[PDB]
Symmetry: C4
Amino acid sequence: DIVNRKVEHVEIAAFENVDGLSSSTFLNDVILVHQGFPGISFSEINTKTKFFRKEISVPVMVTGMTGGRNELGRINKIIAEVAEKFGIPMGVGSQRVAIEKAEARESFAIVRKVAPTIPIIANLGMPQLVKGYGLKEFQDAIQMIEADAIAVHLNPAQEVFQPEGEPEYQIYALEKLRDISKELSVPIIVKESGNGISMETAKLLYSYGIKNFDTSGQGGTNWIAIEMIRDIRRGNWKAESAKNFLDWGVPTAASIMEVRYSVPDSFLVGSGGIRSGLDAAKAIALGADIAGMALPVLKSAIEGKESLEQFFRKIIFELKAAMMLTGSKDVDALKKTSIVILGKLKEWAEYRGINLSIYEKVRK
Amino acid sequence: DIVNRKVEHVEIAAFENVDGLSSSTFLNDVILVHQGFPGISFSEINTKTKFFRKEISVPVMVTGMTGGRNELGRINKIIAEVAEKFGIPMGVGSQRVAIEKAEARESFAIVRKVAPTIPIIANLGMPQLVKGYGLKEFQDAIQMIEADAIAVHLNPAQEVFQPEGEPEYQIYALEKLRDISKELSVPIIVKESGNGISMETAKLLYSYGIKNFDTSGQGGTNWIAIEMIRDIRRGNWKAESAKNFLDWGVPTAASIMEVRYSVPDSFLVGSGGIRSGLDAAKAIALGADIAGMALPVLKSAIEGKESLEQFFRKIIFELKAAMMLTGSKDVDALKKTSIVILGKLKEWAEYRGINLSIYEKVRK
Amino acid sequence: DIVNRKVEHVEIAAFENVDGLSSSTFLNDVILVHQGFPGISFSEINTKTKFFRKEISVPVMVTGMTGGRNELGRINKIIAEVAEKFGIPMGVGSQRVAIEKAEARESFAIVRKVAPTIPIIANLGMPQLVKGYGLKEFQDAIQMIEADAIAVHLNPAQEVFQPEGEPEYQIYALEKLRDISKELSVPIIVKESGNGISMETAKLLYSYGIKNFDTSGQGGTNWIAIEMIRDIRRGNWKAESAKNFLDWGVPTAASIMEVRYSVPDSFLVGSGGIRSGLDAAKAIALGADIAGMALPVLKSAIEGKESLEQFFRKIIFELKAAMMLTGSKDVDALKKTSIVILGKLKEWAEYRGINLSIYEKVRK
Amino acid sequence: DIVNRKVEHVEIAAFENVDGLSSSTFLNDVILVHQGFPGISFSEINTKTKFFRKEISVPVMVTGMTGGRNELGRINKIIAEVAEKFGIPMGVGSQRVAIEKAEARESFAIVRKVAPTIPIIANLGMPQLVKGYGLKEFQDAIQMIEADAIAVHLNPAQEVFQPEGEPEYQIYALEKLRDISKELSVPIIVKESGNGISMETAKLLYSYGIKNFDTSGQGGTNWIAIEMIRDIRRGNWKAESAKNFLDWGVPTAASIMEVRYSVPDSFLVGSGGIRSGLDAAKAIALGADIAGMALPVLKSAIEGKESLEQFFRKIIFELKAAMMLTGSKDVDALKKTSIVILGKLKEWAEYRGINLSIYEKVRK
Ligand SMILES: Cc1cc2c(cc1C)N(C[C@H](O)[C@H](O)[C@H](O)COP(=O)(O)O)c1[nH]c(=O)[nH]c(=O)c1N2
Ligand SMILES: Cc1cc2c(cc1C)N(C[C@H](O)[C@H](O)[C@H](O)COP(=O)(O)O)c1[nH]c(=O)[nH]c(=O)c1N2
Ligand SMILES: Cc1cc2c(cc1C)N(C[C@H](O)[C@H](O)[C@H](O)COP(=O)(O)O)c1[nH]c(=O)[nH]c(=O)c1N2
Ligand SMILES: Cc1cc2c(cc1C)N(C[C@H](O)[C@H](O)[C@H](O)COP(=O)(O)O)c1[nH]c(=O)[nH]c(=O)c1N2
Ligand SMILES: C=C(C)CCOP(=O)(O)OP(=O)(O)O
Ligand SMILES: C=C(C)CCOP(=O)(O)OP(=O)(O)O
Ligand SMILES: C=C(C)CCOP(=O)(O)OP(=O)(O)O
Ligand SMILES: C=C(C)CCOP(=O)(O)OP(=O)(O)O
Ligand SMILES: [Mg+2]
Ligand SMILES: [Mg+2]
Ligand SMILES: [Mg+2]
Ligand SMILES: [Mg+2]
């Protein structure tokens, strides 16, 4: 039944109109300055970068999405095997369902069978931390897939509008996270889920020992929109209320600036509406360490292995083109390349006390 | 015949296209910063707040609309009984008609019969203060409904274009108001009617002892538009002139900033185009103490008691969602939550000498 | 044949699409702050103001348009007789045609016959000053209609694209103007003709002793468009070039700011696209002493006397409404009333070195 | 086969939708201040200017486009003969094809036969400098057309997406260029090709002795678009990636500001999307020494000699009109005339550290 929601989620995300519905990443407001003389050759471009104690081929990750049933595990298989081939890290979807039901475990475990070397990231929702889950559940999630880290997702916006939603975010959960991070053999990443991380949230999480963030800003997959559709579907009145919140959240680009600024030493994934290698390039240039993607990886995976391979080739090429055209020989250079910030993103930063000079020094 | 205009008013407002016609609240320019980690649970959210000497359930009020005839009193009945059930304060429409005609009294008195505990707000138009009305008419309006305060409405824009309009706003009217407030057992609120309160108007009213404002800015019910329709209807040439003024006024958001800034200790209702709980939340976050609504309450009430209940539930849920998603456990926390001001609202404030730093300290 | 151009001009202006074609006044960027408590009554509003040594009923003038043939004189008759009735000043069109041809004189003289008291403004084009015209031609123009002043028009943009155009603006013409102003019994106004006066032009003219300006900015009648149409009409290749210049010029609102700022003591008419009393009020509030109108007066006059009366009633009402709703009891109060400048007009002023603070003090 | 690409290029550029596709010059953000009193006569306007050691009639050049085959040479003939007639300088297309194939030489040599006096500009791509080309190939390109200068084009964006593209821009190429410039009898211009020159690229090139730049910014011919079409055509998957980059680059107007600011003493051609004499006027006023055009010259040339003559007449007239209407008697006065910078261009400059005051002094 939670397994039913899991299938609905995938199905609405993949086949309904929810990608960037009434929302925006603000990435249009970020421009990478073109360099007519790059000072490099396309083939000397190096996209390698660190992901905790591993090295990855490309500063892009697949962020967590699914699992909990066979056809979901078959998707997870296709993602993992292609991700392995390309040397790119992969998060799995929430493993709650696999803690609750042993039959769901294989649909997550398959990932490490087929992807023995890339970093694999576990997944549990923050609401579970106030509702009982602790160190052991974490370790179970981790060891079930021999994870190199665990993502704990923030999704209060989704919980609020979800028909069976659990909108529980008492501060107690953070004390518990901080305790759990004491005893855990792998690092914790805290990630949003389409509504983005603000500087207040990031600073709070940092004061509790969290150093790793995944922005998951608005403008990509709209989870409020997904839950609105679930509400429409079962005649729940919450639907029209969700409609008013469709553009709620921190835009991805704003979130990248906010986290990088307020926690300069953070390890930062920039995600939420990353749809090309250009987007990936802007996110990293803006301040992220890596770019994250979910929805378009799902869509390709559903079409098949080769379709997903073609997708990744395209992203990689697009990334390397932005690198080439900015004179960025490696990921480090991309992080310090020249940008222009315009429009609404500019105004958002000014209002939020983000001094653009100290910001340029911070991102490098 | 004034009774006739009362019916026309309700009819055009309810059934014609006058809500936000060529006007804007500027509320799009106000963004509430999303908090991925709220630090609270949805069910611990407390929406209680003070309304003079009473406590109300929710920082929303129904602002004055109608009365003066039976079908109008039946509307007033539906609004009051539902308002009572929800613990939300209700203003009545202008009581002028009930001073002039004793048959109209019941359509206002019904309100206290059916709503014995919530705050009820009396209503008289400022033009009447230069045209004879004083202490005794105020007390009649007040005691006719056992009001907890009296709203005095400003509507010069309406009076200008009204076919039978009385555009009389001599300063003598404020001298009188200030005298009347000496002798009155309840506080006075001064409210606009779709065209908003500026810092000049607010400062002037304050210098006459007025401490309670209701912004009633543009972007909601367009009273110029209503009067234009009345003019078109009776071939009056004023109609085309009204058309040029459709976007005249201080937008609600700008008005909230203006009043809060220029009179920091004011008790402020933010109204004019509040259409959702999100709207209500933005207005409070911006600087209002409570949000006000009129037109959508009318529209629901006309559909029936249960429709109006469903409406209020929706508003309340929406409000609580905005509070949840900003980490606001109570109304006080909402007033100090993080916001972004962009666009035309930003430019309005900059031009008007509203320093954004001293503004942030003021709204707290 | 110049008389032919005169009818073509009136015909294209009146019946073709040239009013604000691809151009803008920027008056959208000017907002008059609404006052919910005006502090005055509509009927105590006083719209009287000085126009040189005369008093006029309303701070609006009809700026020069036509003359030179019978049906043109009949239009001039209708404008003058209605202007007389309302106590509003009237400029006539260029009197060049009547210096060149004695048969054309009656079509200008008719104006003083039928309007014995209002200020009447003569008209000659600046190119004529480099092409022979001097003191005597000026006195003829003036005494032909017992003018209270003479308007010398700037129209180089028009002359450039006019098929028979005379784009001659040597500085010599200003030396001559300054000499002519020595000997003249009435003051000189320098006015543009749909392309606006900049601070460079206004300072230059002032340095030659010109104190009276009429902005005639873009966003109203488009004279480049009119000449383009004349070019299309006679297969002249200049037509497509004109098309690229359709939005050439200083927008009316920018021109008002520019002139007022760079020559603070100027007597300033704000015109070019004034279409309502609201427009008229913005131009005055912005910094003009009076608002000017041409095209919509022409259009009404062509429909007839009573149509033009209805037009002027409408303008006056609209003006008084803007006065009422800003608490402006008289024209002076309107000149110092509260405004907001937004958008492109704000950017224009910032770039041009118009300090908004010293600007507010200057317009008062 | 390189000769095949040469005809494809011309064919797609002339007949497909690639001019300003999803791109912008930012020239809309630049406004020339209209002068109602120019202080000059249209016929005294002098458009003569220097182009290295020659004098040219008009501050406009035709920038390099084509050559390499007969029907291409016949185009080059039409361009050169008309350019000769008007006294405007002409660049030829890349001469690579004529170094590689002796049969292609005539299609470039024809230019000097028919245009013995105007400046003619040679052309070689930067990629060729990394791939073997040196002093002798340069001299062959120069002497083949008795060139007055050689343009070295930057096109890494095009190379990246070109199906047979050579995206090689190692810094080694600049050491080589600086060496070649030692031994060369004519000066070197470095020009972009639709994607614009940034301050980083311009400062780099200057450090290597390059003093002459041609912006070729975005907003005109979109070379990424042309290669996208070539990719679509041969089913190459790079096509969809190109689609994401259609708006990549420095907008022409931004590029002009960037180069002029970061190398104040540069000789600067402003090109990319120059489509009228007004555009040409803005680019010069902004900071360029001359305006450059390619695409619309090609399109006219294909129609024929007389069509191209009519084109140039129109450009010249448009230029002189902008000069007339700003009071610019000669090209120098145009360079210091009054402008307004608004919008996105303004934001671009502010972010890039272009101080608008020091900028106004630098362009004069
Ligand atoms: C079908 C599906 C299912 C999920 C997700 C996504 C989608 C598309 N996402 C959120 C995801 O990881 C990401 O943070 C947001 O989707 C924003 O990225 P995109 O715009 O989708 O690239 C997600 N997040 C997570 O932490 N736990 C979860 O189980 C899921 N579930
Ligand atoms: C039919 C109807 C009738 C009235 C009103 C409204 C409507 C819709 N309003 C104005 C109202 O209280 C409020 O200030 C404005 O309508 C702006 O809020 P809304 O945009 O309608 O929520 C109103 N105001 C008041 O002070 N006295 C009055 O009697 C009336 N009459
Ligand atoms: C048919 C017609 C004829 C003329 C004009 C106008 C029209 C519509 N205008 C220009 C006019 O006075 C005014 O400056 C501009 O038209 C801008 O104002 P409007 O937008 O038309 O109100 C004009 N100006 C002037 O100084 N001398 C002239 O003879 C004329 N001729
Ligand atoms: C058909 C064709 C072919 C070429 C070009 C253009 C066109 C239209 N351009 C680029 C040109 O010189 C210019 O820099 C850009 O086209 C931008 O200017 P326009 O927007 O076209 O005026 C060009 N540039 C160059 O340096 N070498 C080349 O051979 C070509 N080839
Ligand atoms: C986008 C996300 C984070 C999907 C998880 O939503 P759920 O609320 O269905 O996740 P669990 O309850 O199964 O953790
Ligand atoms: C929107 C408002 C304020 C309605 C009141 O209009 P009226 O002008 O009919 O009010 P009274 O004259 O009855 O006070
Ligand atoms: C809009 C205006 C100023 C009309 C005058 O144009 P003309 O150029 O025909 O005027 P004269 O030559 O008759 O002065
Ligand atoms: C816009 C430009 C610079 C066209 C040159 O493209 P190519 O890449 O076809 O030029 P060559 O290889 O022939 O130099
Ligand atoms: Mg959950
Ligand atoms: Mg009234
Ligand atoms: Mg003339
Ligand atoms: Mg090449």
